[PDB]
Design an enzyme around this catalytic site. Sequence first.
Site, PDB file in Angstrom:
ATOM      1  N   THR A 197      -7.735 -15.125  -2.223  1.00 39.05           N
ATOM      2  CA  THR A 197      -8.202 -14.680  -0.902  1.00 39.05           C
ATOM      3  C   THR A 197      -9.426 -15.517  -0.527  1.00 39.05           C
ATOM      4  OG1 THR A 197      -7.236 -12.433  -1.028  1.00 39.05           O
ATOM      5  CG2 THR A 197      -9.366 -12.647   0.125  1.00 39.05           C
ATOM      6  N   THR A 232      -2.983  -6.759 -10.636  1.00 43.39           N
ATOM      7  CA  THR A 232      -3.323  -5.839 -11.711  1.00 43.39           C
ATOM      8  C   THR A 232      -3.655  -4.406 -11.266  1.00 43.39           C
ATOM      9  OG1 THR A 232      -5.610  -6.673 -11.614  1.00 43.39           O
ATOM     10  CG2 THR A 232      -4.195  -7.637 -13.247  1.00 43.39           C
ATOM     11  N   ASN A 266      -4.707   3.927  -4.750  1.00 38.86           N
ATOM     12  CA  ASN A 266      -3.289   4.177  -4.500  1.00 38.86           C
ATOM     13  C   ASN A 266      -2.528   4.813  -5.641  1.00 38.86           C
ATOM     14  OD1 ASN A 266      -2.137   2.883  -1.796  1.00 38.86           O
ATOM     15  ND2 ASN A 266      -4.004   1.809  -2.413  1.00 38.86           N
ATOM     16  N   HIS A 319       0.835  -1.199   0.000  1.00 40.02           N
ATOM     17  CA  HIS A 319       0.000   0.000   0.000  1.00 40.02           C
ATOM     18  C   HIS A 319       0.860   1.234   0.000  1.00 40.02           C
ATOM     19  CE1 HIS A 319      -3.457  -2.179   1.355  1.00 40.02           C
ATOM     20  NE2 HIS A 319      -2.789  -2.663   2.387  1.00 40.02           N
ATOM     21  N   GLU A 335      -4.903  -1.321  -8.003  1.00 41.49           N
ATOM     22  CA  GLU A 335      -6.057  -0.696  -7.347  1.00 41.49           C
ATOM     23  C   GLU A 335      -5.959   0.777  -7.717  1.00 41.49           C
ATOM     24  OE1 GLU A 335      -4.095  -1.539  -3.504  1.00 41.49           O
ATOM     25  OE2 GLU A 335      -5.526  -3.157  -3.058  1.00 41.49           O
ATOM     26  N   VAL A 389      -7.333 -14.348 -15.051  1.00 39.78           N
ATOM     27  CA  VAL A 389      -5.946 -14.168 -14.533  1.00 39.78           C
ATOM     28  C   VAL A 389      -5.427 -15.485 -13.938  1.00 39.78           C
ATOM     29  CG1 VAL A 389      -4.538 -12.852 -12.922  1.00 39.78           C
ATOM     30  CG2 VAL A 389      -6.407 -11.766 -14.164  1.00 39.78           C
ATOM     31  N   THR A 428       1.663  -3.815  -7.143  1.00 37.27           N
ATOM     32  CA  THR A 428       1.283  -3.494  -8.536  1.00 37.27           C
ATOM     33  C   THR A 428       2.510  -2.896  -9.169  1.00 37.27           C
ATOM     34  OG1 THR A 428      -0.928  -2.944  -7.756  1.00 37.27           O
ATOM     35  CG2 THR A 428      -0.330  -2.220  -9.978  1.00 37.27           C
ATOM     36  N   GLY A 467      -8.555 -13.108  -8.768  1.00 37.46           N
ATOM     37  CA  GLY A 467      -9.875 -13.333  -8.198  1.00 37.46           C
ATOM     38  C   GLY A 467     -10.879 -13.911  -9.177  1.00 37.46           C
ATOM     39  N   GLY A 468     -10.399 -14.286 -10.345  1.00 34.84           N
ATOM     40  CA  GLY A 468     -11.215 -14.815 -11.419  1.00 34.84           C
ATOM     41  C   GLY A 468     -10.410 -15.741 -12.278  1.00 34.84           C
TER      42      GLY A 468
END
Lengths: 304, 324
Positions: free
Chosen positions: A194, A106, A111, A39, A108, A180, A75, A176-177
């Site tokens: 996650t 990929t 940030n 972050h 966010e 990817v 990222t 998350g899918g």
Amino acid sequence: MVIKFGYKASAEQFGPRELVELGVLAEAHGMDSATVSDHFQPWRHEGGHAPFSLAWMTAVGERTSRLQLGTSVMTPTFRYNPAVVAQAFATMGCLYPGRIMLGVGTGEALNEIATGFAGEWPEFKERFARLREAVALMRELWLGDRVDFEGNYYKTVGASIYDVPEGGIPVYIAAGGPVVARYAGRSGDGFICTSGKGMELYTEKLMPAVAEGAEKADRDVAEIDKMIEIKISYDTDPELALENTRFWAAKRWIVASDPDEAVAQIRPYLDAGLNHLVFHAPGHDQKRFLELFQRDLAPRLRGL
Amino acid sequence: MVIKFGYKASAEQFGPRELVELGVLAEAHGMDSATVSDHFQPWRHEGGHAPFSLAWMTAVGERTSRLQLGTSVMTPTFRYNPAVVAQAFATMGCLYPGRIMLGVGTGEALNEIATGFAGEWPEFKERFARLREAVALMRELWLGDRVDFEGNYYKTVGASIYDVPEGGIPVYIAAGGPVVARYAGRSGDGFICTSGKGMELYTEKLMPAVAEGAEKADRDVAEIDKMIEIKISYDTDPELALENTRFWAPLSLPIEMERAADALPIEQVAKRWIVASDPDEAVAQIRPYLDAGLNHLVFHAPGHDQKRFLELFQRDLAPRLRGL
């Protein structure tokens, strides 16, 4: 890949020194890995901190001798130059041989907007393409020499990294899918997801996608480390187990005061084929979590 | 500012673990500071290196307790996002309280072109404007709450850094001429220059410039740390004192360039190094920098055997320097 238990350090919740000391305690309490999210923005509401991830990795590395350390995730495509990311990770891998990985996603927007990203946030296809390109660039620097990488987004000219372990640094791809995840199966050294979505996400979408990609690329899927971040509030005191979640403001969390119930809630991830379980706990007393994990949870999990 | 003696760790010359162990040895041998240059490209092909500066600083920090650590220097303006630089240095400053500085320069093209910089390389005025803007952005972040910065080059939106020491992180500006030296007087917590360039540079151009900038900004010039990289090849063996300069021959003039360097007569290679094998003679050549008002001497020794340099420095040179 072999079963491993690790610790997710919460960069939003602790300042730099405490965060480092928790990574060191993670090794002291038997964890196989410790990871941190990259972050920039400290959010008042998520705890008010954001220690720089690579400083955390290095400080913990220099204090430890076994623990695997990495980002979950960073990222590498907007506020960093991917060449410089490759340099940072190569150096760290030299300093901590066999114990560094680069976990990437990929991206966010918040940030990146905070750090000066200009114009419209790209759509998913462009973010994903940028990630694959940056991964290739970084690996080319690790494996080759005098690299003239000329991608659609990133570039190098005569670039070299001499100070790198042979073969570079493991790259873990978060997904998350299935789109990817198939990329992770084709190209990742590891995969990150996650917990706390329905179990069908893992068993019907993500694990089959990783296996598909590994098939398409002619690789043995067993060599991909399959990491899952598991959100868990465990405490033998029933009230503290529940009350520790109030920092975080299907069920997304395991909340338990009985260690067999906790283990029962973790087991389905192992049965789905995730082998590298990384635990993320909400309480302020992370030292207690690490102590209770080691005392109560780890022996029960190894017993499965 | 008080006199201090420190160590320049050569990222150009050593891989990551060795460089870190040299930083740690600098503290064991009594050095007050250690700094590292921040390059991307290995400095040369033959025996060249480039460990990542921030990993070196952090790993040495975690192994030490007294040593001031910093860059000498990094360019925060092209391949780095200055807000991320500010984050990185603020974190390190929390980890190693009172021991971290950010040393910055206007940059050199080779490293930026290597890492993808597009188009014409800016001239000094524009590189220096970018540097000043980056420094201002970092300071706003360190000292502010939720910062909206918008310059000619850099931008932030609601950006914060809360994990930062009180007062921020000291910024040291590399200066080769009076213009930048005046800016260091106005705005720097320190300035950095390099030895061997003819004493008038320090006494007539750089020192007076820093003082003038300080006066224009209503500062006490004594608060600014005045750092100099002292290029010194000290070895009690006179053949090594000379020959240990060899690695650095590219400074004394493409694969042809390096062949040309390897072939240079060693006297030419050694011209801007203090070459000494007698400790009083060494100190006599160091003393004029102290007399010019530089207070923070960071010693850069050229040879591969840096542990021997550090042991020799502590034995022979540090007592004589403290005796001035």
